[PDB]
Design an enzyme around this catalytic site. Structure first.
Site, PDB file in Angstrom:
ATOM      1  N   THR A   1      13.298   0.476 -25.448  1.00  0.00           N
ATOM      2  CA  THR A   1      13.856   1.672 -24.834  1.00  0.00           C
ATOM      3  C   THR A   1      12.710   2.618 -24.478  1.00  0.00           C
ATOM      4  O   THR A   1      11.653   2.570 -25.102  1.00  0.00           O
ATOM      5  CB  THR A   1      14.863   2.361 -25.793  1.00  0.00           C
ATOM      6  OG1 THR A   1      15.992   1.503 -25.998  1.00  0.00           O
ATOM      7  CG2 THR A   1      15.359   3.683 -25.234  1.00  0.00           C
ATOM      8  N   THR A   2      12.908   3.468 -23.471  1.00  0.00           N
ATOM      9  CA  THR A   2      11.943   4.519 -23.159  1.00  0.00           C
ATOM     10  C   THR A   2      12.668   5.653 -22.452  1.00  0.00           C
ATOM     11  O   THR A   2      13.157   5.479 -21.333  1.00  0.00           O
ATOM     12  CB  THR A   2      10.795   4.012 -22.301  1.00  0.00           C
ATOM     13  OG1 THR A   2      10.118   2.954 -22.985  1.00  0.00           O
ATOM     14  CG2 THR A   2       9.820   5.147 -22.063  1.00  0.00           C
TER      15      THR A   2
ATOM     16  N   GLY B   1      11.171   6.020 -27.829  1.00  0.00           N
ATOM     17  CA  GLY B   1      11.403   4.621 -27.532  1.00  0.00           C
ATOM     18  C   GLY B   1      10.211   3.726 -27.794  1.00  0.00           C
ATOM     19  O   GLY B   1       9.121   4.209 -28.112  1.00  0.00           O
ATOM     20  N   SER B   2      10.415   2.411 -27.677  1.00  0.00           N
ATOM     21  CA  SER B   2       9.322   1.468 -27.894  1.00  0.00           C
ATOM     22  C   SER B   2       8.192   1.692 -26.898  1.00  0.00           C
ATOM     23  O   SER B   2       7.012   1.661 -27.268  1.00  0.00           O
ATOM     24  CB  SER B   2       9.843   0.036 -27.804  1.00  0.00           C
ATOM     25  OG  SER B   2      10.556  -0.169 -26.597  1.00  0.00           O
TER      26      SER B   2
ATOM     27  N   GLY C   1      10.556  -3.718 -24.224  1.00  0.00           N
ATOM     28  CA  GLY C   1      11.790  -3.038 -24.563  1.00  0.00           C
ATOM     29  C   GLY C   1      12.292  -2.083 -23.505  1.00  0.00           C
ATOM     30  O   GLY C   1      13.432  -1.618 -23.608  1.00  0.00           O
TER      31      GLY C   1
END
Ligand code: SA1
Ligand code: SA1
Ligand code: SA1
Lengths: 191, 205, 204, 208, 203, 230, 212, 204, 191
Positions: free
Chosen positions: E1-2, E129-130, E169
């Site tokens: 996720t970001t 996020g990652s 991700g």
């Protein structure tokens, strides 16, 4: 493992804390005020998970204000310190608050209390929570003189924070220092 | 998590009409981090043999160099290029010699038989359990995705153009469902006359 | 597994079950758990099947090695078989979970040695081993007599191994009997139809 | 989830006249053949039999629950029993409740009964609470040692289904350590539940 | 996720990827990681998808309840505080919420980083996020206060794009949101596949 | 996997499914699990495909070298002893649950060899994940001195039982019938007939497929180069 | 002790302009054993939507019973059948109610909204909701997802409009993808239950698949 | 521990060993493992001693509770005792490792219920439990007859529990016999001197 | 988890490494040269335990010198990179060197290789080992242009190191940057 450092003087308390908040390997903010002003007289530096520190700070500040409003008297620094100690003693056994604190308060006398998540309360001339104590206590021992002036106090706190920056592997990107004196808690810059 | 998942890989090989097509993602990733988009997982082993190593980049290079050592020694000592089946058995031997400390790469040998020019796909696991799919051989972290897409999409007797078409599209579909795979594709179409090395565009996320 | 070797006056009766078990599954229902080490020396096997079969083949090798430099091949062979079973079990105690009852006939007469999974070898007139031997320990103690002949001991061993087969899930199948006398070894198989008892003995 | 005192395999299969269920009458304590002549099926209603393979203590607790609920609904309905579908639904919901409470009944429970409409109902609820209705259900090694011997004859003549179940339980007696003793057969037909004479289903012992 | 969100002179730009992926498989590339909370407030979704979606719609419910109970709308600080208190009450339950409460209230622009752990950090530039480290690198390197709306939206979009490129991700499409005094504005969903410059040979 | 070898009057019938799974996914649908050892011996193996293939190749090489140097027909108990010793010396790490099926001077012999080295002579054996579904058929349909065709059908039906009942087993039933070329002549040459895809279950085939394959993925080619194949 | 059986089985949903085609394999199976060759996993929740659950069958049955209970309660207390979007939100909240004891089931809520448009919602076991044009769940989700990506290109190009695939073409796509999964996923197999929600209502078809 | 309750024609013979074991140490060598729940209802106890004694006292409480609202106090009391033993074991299966054989006489006659450690209650004509029961399973199957009277069953139970005492380290001491008929319950103690067999039965 | 960052240019390679050596929570030195000059042409930045990095660097430098002396030819950058890769591939399986490296060499052409303890060798225009890659790769992606000048290269490396300092929780107290060009490996300061 956040670096909070307290230094008690004859009529003041310099309470500094790591101003870098973090999420995992990311420094989310470089000016996060980890020192909690529970009262106008008491600043509680907190080392621990940002969430635990925030929740405990809000609970303690709300309870201090509620004591001030329920009874037309403000908590002392010993009374507040032991209230925090009671809160931590309750927490450790059931639902622990994983926060190690330095309570700096001025109620006509300077006070600095070493508090930990378990609930060990000790009035100290100087101290630290986190790994920074391993770096700053000696400097205090080496350079603290009774009757230290506020300028000498700022110099000594600056020396301790510089030792944290230089020798601590996880060097805080900066510190927020607050002077707790007869005028209240005022944020200062040590340069 | 897993050592194989450390370097995301997606190698595909497909059989056409007297032609094979070995495609591979072009990403060198370290777990969830993209390090490079120019990582070579398909290697030419012989004029009519290509080896795609889907797995740990360390073992991709180690296995590729060890099989270039073995193939070069065989071709020097025999004055003849190695056969696709001979090279398949060579890779099986190489992997099973390390059976109990296995290379974390699944090889995919896409070749053409020396005389009949028939397609020859041969994909094994980490330890040389070679399969010989007449249709498609998949490997890497996209293994389930590649199996799914190629089962429906692959059709018999695909000419080099159609074989490239599914190799590219089917590999794109696989890599775009694998987070640690993608960042560009490379498809080697091996035919009787020429090898066509087409760098295809996949999602770069 | 039920192993029951009886050293009789006129021979050795090695009774065994025929059930190899992988948990609740029986991979082999007609197992030859008594291995012919020599024509008159047999090894009833309990514990890990692979370890016991390795033990049997290694003891065949060790007893042939005993014969490399000697001509009295039928001399002290059962005792040496027990000793090599015991030395392999103690040497490989970490890796071999094998118990073996080696019985037969040699120059010393009929013999029955019980080498335990621990690697403890004891010359026994009556030896039993395996999970099923537990269920028949009292039965053996009540029905075993030192003076039993090879036929009496064969009947008693069939009955005891049948009781163990009935009461033990790990023990089952046919009663593999081996009767070793001076003349040789006679193998018999007591199939469930020919077994003296049935599951009906349970609850009367 | 732990099985100690376990009931052996069960093979239930629908045939023309009803459901034929077979299982040994032996409860095994670990590997020991501990109890004999213990039916793995309990007639909870005149046309509803309930068996279970696995811990028999959890099947006795489940049968207590089933009988209590059937008694409740029978008192409410002045003698009318719950239907096989209703009984299996209650077993599915109570075994899923037990699994959700982290105290699962470690028994795969076959409910075989004739619903009042006359349709054969054979369903199974595993210890976890996953239930399924099928024309033939094997539980324990009766599921594993089955092959096509039931599926080919399921819904067929009683003789064909009986032969298929007998083949499966010959395999069970041959290759299941916990298979001990006669194999009781129970026919749940719209005419009631009939316990056919238990049969010793011998494995082919000319193998030796 | 970001997910990223930054406050510039013109408002709050919140750019989010759209990839939901567990392990290696990309379960989705069209996940909406910006959930509106108030007419001029949104909450970003990072970490656990179910947790972020449930707790952000619960925070939306609580904000609406507060606005109807009391005419004054719930502020961005108050909303983030509600969310952080609720999430902290579930400490030790392995919730995974990374969520920037980005809104414009009576006191102006406000971004509060909220996490399952109970951390509630006010700031003008966050990334969760990652791949948030990559978005942070692009932001902190290219961020200016005096960027136009287009410039700030493109900055957030490109930071999310570089995060998607460098992080497995992160991926899908950059949903860009501009939050101003007037209210939440949904700029566009830009496929990072189109954002990638394939004329470059370095990445 | 479902492998099952039985001994009929004139010989041995080995059988195996053709499904290799790379976890929950069917990697191979034509996997060869019947491994030629010698002209008289075939091993059908389960467990780890690499381990089975390599150990069968190694023992086939050992027995081919044996038959060459010594001029002797490999024995089924000889092959089984070699396999069991090799699997024991690897302490079960070579996960090759094998079923040796051959014909030597002792007649038709079927041996099981567990991955840990435990072997056993049995008339009918089933190994693999579907070994139970197969052994049921083998338990119910095997009898002493059955003819070749009945044993073929029984072993194929046991492999089919494993195929249908077991998820790890599927696709086709490959058989291998070891038999003497002249059954009436016990000294005749032991030949083998391998029936690849002896059973091809029609209900287990791909029953649907988009005739116009719908695809909305467009390939953009960054760079193309053509190189000669010589 | 893990309270889930981790049952395999694939469900492939495809939302259309005016239809929703969810095809899920009937087979109930885990650990190389098929508990039930036929065990329907797509259920007509009401006249507006259908729910397709793949995963632990105990949790499938429990969640479907809970969803039927909640939809009946909604019909009784709100005087109309719960809409596909309302059912989707309810599915999200129902799954999240067990966030700490999750239903180990992946949900596809496919229905026809008040506008008449198809609405497919994909879920994870913990209740993530996602309005999707297509989704794949279960053991063969990794297998089937590239099939749908190729059929539509939505993953390849996220922002492009979803292709106007006809109802019958979407049904064929789901059938072909389920057949490919059955060929590759061991758990997927037996019969395909191809359910379609349209303005005409809930339609159901049973197609054979490779049992092996 | 050896438990052996036999439902005879004219009563119930509950034989038990008297050895409480803490590993290889015997804290109690004269244990009363058969607890008098009621004057004609006894509970032979195996497994954890504390859990079984709690079970016995709780079943006394439950059977007295059964009598709070009824006057037929000797009616279905053994079946109810087995049911409460079973409900306490299943209710406390995580914490109670207790198996109980409850036997005696009531309005229904002589009864013997074997509730296993799992909590499985079975009415048994011949019930055995404990580690020592394993060693005597075959012995019981060979020597138990349905037609045995209370004296014949008492002798057989003494012999079987003595064999279990001999072959089991966990089982030992004296054979606590309880003979429950319609008249009442007679306790007997068969001391090792009065036990029919000795350790000498081992190896003949 | 030490921050080494490489940046390859048209005719140069800027290889930077965390200059802070550490023992537990103590920053023992603030100028430790983690970049190993195996040859006059090749500088090997190493991220890992100081001991493992030092031993591996000394082994590789000794082997490079031994190749230069045994044969009157110096290793190329591809040849040296694959020799390092062979060493790491040997180590991982037996006695692993837990060092992730960036090999920057100029042999008439600039070369930058991403190497890890396992032995993954990849020529890269830019890269990093440690957690710093999570912070610097994007900045490179955002700001790297083909044909980058050496001054623009120093600016970009400075930007990457500043991102490490600002966003990485364990911020290195400083970096040592080395320019690997036709003139060799020269230590530089980026200000
Ligand atoms: C018996 O000991 C047993 C059998 O497998 C047996 C082993 C030795 C001879 C061959 C067959 N070993 C076991 O592991 C099981 C459990 C107890 O008894 C077994 C059946
Ligand atoms: C069979 O046991 C199986 C096959 O891959 C099989 C292996 C040996 C011979 C070649 C093919 N082994 C496995 O790992 C899977 C798991 C289920 O059984 C397999 C299909
Ligand atoms: C018997 O079951 C036993 C005894 O302590 C026994 C328990 C119940 C009645 C009182 C005395 N329980 C044990 O834990 C040991 C091990 C096996 O048998 C025991 C002696």
């Amino acid at each position: 493992m956040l670096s909070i450092v307290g230094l008690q003087g004859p009529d003041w308390v310099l309470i500094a804390a790591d101003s870098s908040v973090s999420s995992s390997i990311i420094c989310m903010s470089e000016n996060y005020d980890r020192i909690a002003q529970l009262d106008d007289r008491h600043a509680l530096a907190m080392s621990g998970e940002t969430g635990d520190c925030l929740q405990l700070s809000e609970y303690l500040q709300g309870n201090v204000a509620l004591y001030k409003f329920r009874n037309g008297v403000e908590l002392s620094s010993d009374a507040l310190a032991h209230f925090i100690r009671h809160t931590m003693a309750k927490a450790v056994r059931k639902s622990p608050y994983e926060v190690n604190m330095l309570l700096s308060g001025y109620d006509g006398k300077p006070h600095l209390y070493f508090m930990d998540y378990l609930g060990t309360l000790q009035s100290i001339p100087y101290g630290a929570q986190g790994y920074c104590q391993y770096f700053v206590m000696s400097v205090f021992d080496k350079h603290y003189k009774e009757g230290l002036t506020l300028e000498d106090g700022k110099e000594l706190m600056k020396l301790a924070l510089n030792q944290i920056k230089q020798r601590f592997t996880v060097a805080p990107h900066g510190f927020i220092v607050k002077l707790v004196d007869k005028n209240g808690i005022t944020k200062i810059d040590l340069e | 998590s897993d050592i194989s998942t450390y370097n995301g890989s997606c190698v595909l090989a497909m059989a056409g009409d007297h032609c094979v097509a070995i495609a591979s993602d072009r990403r060198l990733g370290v777990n969830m981090l993209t390090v490079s988009k120019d990582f070579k997982r398909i290697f030419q082993i012989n004029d009519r043999i290509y080896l795609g190593l889907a797995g740990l980049a360390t073992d991709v290079l180690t296995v590729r160099e060890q099989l270039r050592f073995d193939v070069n020694l065989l071709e020097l000592r025999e004055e003849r290029p190695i056969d696709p089946k001979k090279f398949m058995n060579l890779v099986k031997s190489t992997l099973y010699e390390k059976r109990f400390s296995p290379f974390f790469v699944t090889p995919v040998i896409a070749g053409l038989l020396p005389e009949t020019n028939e397609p020859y796909l041969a994909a094994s696991d980490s330890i040389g359990a070679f399969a010989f799919p007449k249709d498609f051989a998949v490997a890497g972290t996209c293994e389930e995705s590649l199996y799914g897409i190629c089962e429906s999409a692959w059709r018999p007797n695909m000419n080099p153009d159609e074989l490239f078409e599914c190799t590219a599209k089917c590999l794109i579909a696989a890599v775009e469902r694998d987070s640690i795979s993608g960042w560009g594709g490379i498809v080697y179409i091996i035919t009787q006359d020429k090898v066509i090395i087409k760098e295809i565009k996949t999602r770069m996320d | 597994t039920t192993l029951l070797a009886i050293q009789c006056t006129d021979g050795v009766v090695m009774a065994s079950d025929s059930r190899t078990s992988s948990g609740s599954f029986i991979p082999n229902r007609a197992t030859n758990k008594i291995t012919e080490i020599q024509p008159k020396i047999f090894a009833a096997r309990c514990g890990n099947a692979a370890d016991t079969q390795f033990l049997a083949r290694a003891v065949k090798n060790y007893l042939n090695a005993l014969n490399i430099t000697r001509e009295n091949t039928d001399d002290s062979t059962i005792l040496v078989a027990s000793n090599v079973i015991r030395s392999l079990i103690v040497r490989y105690r970490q890796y071999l979970s094998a118990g073996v009852i080696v019985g037969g006939w040699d120059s010393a007469g009929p013999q029955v040695y019980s080498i335990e999974v621990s690697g403890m070898a004891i010359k026994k007139k009556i030896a039993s081993n395996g999970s099923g031997s537990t269920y028949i320990q009292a039965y053996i103690d009540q029905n075993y007599r030192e003076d039993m002949t090879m036929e009496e001991a064969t009947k008693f061993a069939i009955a005891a191994v049948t009781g163990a087969i009935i009461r033990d899930g790990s023990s089952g199948g046919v009663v593999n009997i081996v009767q070793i006398n001076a003349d040789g070894a006679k193998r018999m198989t007591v199939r469930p139809a020919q077994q003296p008892f049935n599951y009906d003995i349970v609850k009367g | 989830m732990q099985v100690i005192t376990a009931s052996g395999a069960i093979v239930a299969a629908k045939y023309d006249g009803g459901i034929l269920l077979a299982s040994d009458l032996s409860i095994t304590y670990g590997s020991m053949f501990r109890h004999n002549n213990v039916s793995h099926f309990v007639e909870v209603a005149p046309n509803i039999i309930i068996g279970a393979s696995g811990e028999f203590a959890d099947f006795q607790t489940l049968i207590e629950v089933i009988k209590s609920v059937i008694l409740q609904q029978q008192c409410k309905h002045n003698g009318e029993y719950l239907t096989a579908s209703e009984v299996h639904n209650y077993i599915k919901r109570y075994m899923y409740q037990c699994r959700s409470n982290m105290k699962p009944l470690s028994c795969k429970v076959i409910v075989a009964g004739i619903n009042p409409d006359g349709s054969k109902f054979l369903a199974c609820t595993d210890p976890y609470g996953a239930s399924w209705e099928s024309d033939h259900i094997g539980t324990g090694f009766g599921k594993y040692l089955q092959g096509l011997q039931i599926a080919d004859v399921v819904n067929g003549s009683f003789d064909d289904v009986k032969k298929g179940i007998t083949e499966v339980f010959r395999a069970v007696n041959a290759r299941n350590t916990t298979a001990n003793g006669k194999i009781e057969f129970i026919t749940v037909t719209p005419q009631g539940i009939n316990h056919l004479a238990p049969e010793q289903i011998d494995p082919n012992w000319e193998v030796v | 996720t970001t997910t990223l969100s930054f406050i510039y002179n013109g408002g709050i730009v919140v750019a989010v990827d759209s990839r939901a992926t567990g392990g290696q498989f990309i379960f989705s590339q069209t996940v909406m990681k910006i959930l509106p909370l108030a007419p001029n407030m949104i909450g970003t979704m990072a970490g656990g998808a179910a947790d972020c979606q449930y707790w952000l719609r619960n925070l939306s419910r609580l904000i609406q309840l507060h606005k109807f109970r009391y005419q004054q709308p719930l502020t961005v600080a108050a909303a983030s505080k509600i969310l952080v208190n609720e999430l902290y009450r579930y400490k030790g339950y392995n919730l995974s919420i990374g969520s920037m409460i980005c809104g414009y209230d009576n006191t102006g622009p406000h971004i509060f980083y909220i996490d399952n752990h109970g951390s509630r950090i006010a700031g003008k530039r966050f990334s969760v996020g990652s791949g948030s480290t990559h978005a942070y690198g692009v932001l902190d390197t290219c961020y200016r206060e005096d960027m136009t709306k287009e410039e700030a939206c493109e900055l957030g979009r490109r930071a999310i794009y570089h995060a998607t490129y460098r992080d497995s991700g992160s991926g899908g499409r950059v949903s860009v949101v501009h939050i101003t005094q007037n209210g939440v504005e949904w700029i566009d969903k830009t496929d990072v596949f189109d954002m990638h410059d394939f004329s470059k040979t370095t990445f | 996997t479902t492998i099952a070898a039985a001994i009929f009057d004139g010989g041995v019938v080995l059988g195996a499914d053709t499904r290799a799974t790379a976890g929950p996914i069917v990697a191979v649908k034509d996997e060869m699990k019947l491994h030629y050892i010698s002209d008289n011996i075939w091993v059908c193996g389960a467990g780890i495909a690499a381990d089975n293939d390599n150990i069968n190749a190694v023992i086939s090489a050992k027995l081919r070298l044996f038959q060459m140097n010594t001029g002797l027909q490999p024995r089924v108990d000889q092959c089984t002893n070699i396999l069991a010793s090799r699997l024991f010396q690897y302490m079960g790490y070579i996960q090759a649950a094998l079923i040796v099926g051959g014909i030597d001077f002792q007649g038709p012999q079927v041996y099981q060899v567990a991955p840990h080295g435990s072997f056993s002579k049995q008339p009918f054996i089933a190994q693999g994940s579907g070994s139970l579904a197969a052994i049921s058929v083998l338990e119910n349909r095997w009898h002493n001195k059955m003819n070749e065709h009945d044993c073929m059908e029984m072993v194929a039906d046991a492999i089919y039982a494993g195929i249908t009942n077991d998820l790890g087993s599927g696709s086709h039933v490959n058989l291998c019938v070891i038999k003497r070329e002249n059954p009436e002549d016990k000294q005749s040459k032991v030949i083998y007939t391998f029936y690849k895809d002896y059973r091809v279950p029609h209900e287990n085939d791909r029953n649907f497929r988009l005739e116009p394959q719908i695809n909305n993925i467009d390939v953009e080619v960054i760079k193309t180069t053509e190189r000669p194949l010589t | 002790w893990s309270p889930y059986e981790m049952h395999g089985g694939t469900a492939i949903g495809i939302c259309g302009d005016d239809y929703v085609v969810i095809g899920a394999d009937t087979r109930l199976s885990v650990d190389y054993s098929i508990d039930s060759r036929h065990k329907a996993r797509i259920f007509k929740m009401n006249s507006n939507c259908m729910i397709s659950a793949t995963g632990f069958d105990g949790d499938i049955d429990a969640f479907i019973t809970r969803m039927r209970s909640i939809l009946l309660n909604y019909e009784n207390q709100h005087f109309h059948e719960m809409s596909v979007e309302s059912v989707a939100r309810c599915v999200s909240n129902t799954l999240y109610s067990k966030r700490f004891f999750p239903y180990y089931i992946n949900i596809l809520v496919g229905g026809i909204n008040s506008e008449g448009k198809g609405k497919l919602y994909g879920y994870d076991p913990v209740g993530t909701i996602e309005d999707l044009h297509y989704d794949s769940n279960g053991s063969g989700s990794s297998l089937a997802a590239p099939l749908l990506d190729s059929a539509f290109g939505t993953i390849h190009h996220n922002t492009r409009p979803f292709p106007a695939v006809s109802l019958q073409d979407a049904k064929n796509i789901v059938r072909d993808a389920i057949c490919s999964v059955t060929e590759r996923d061991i758990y997927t197999g037996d019969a395909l239950q191809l359910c379609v929600f349209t303005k005409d209502g809930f339609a159901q078809e049973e197609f054979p698949l490779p049992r092996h």
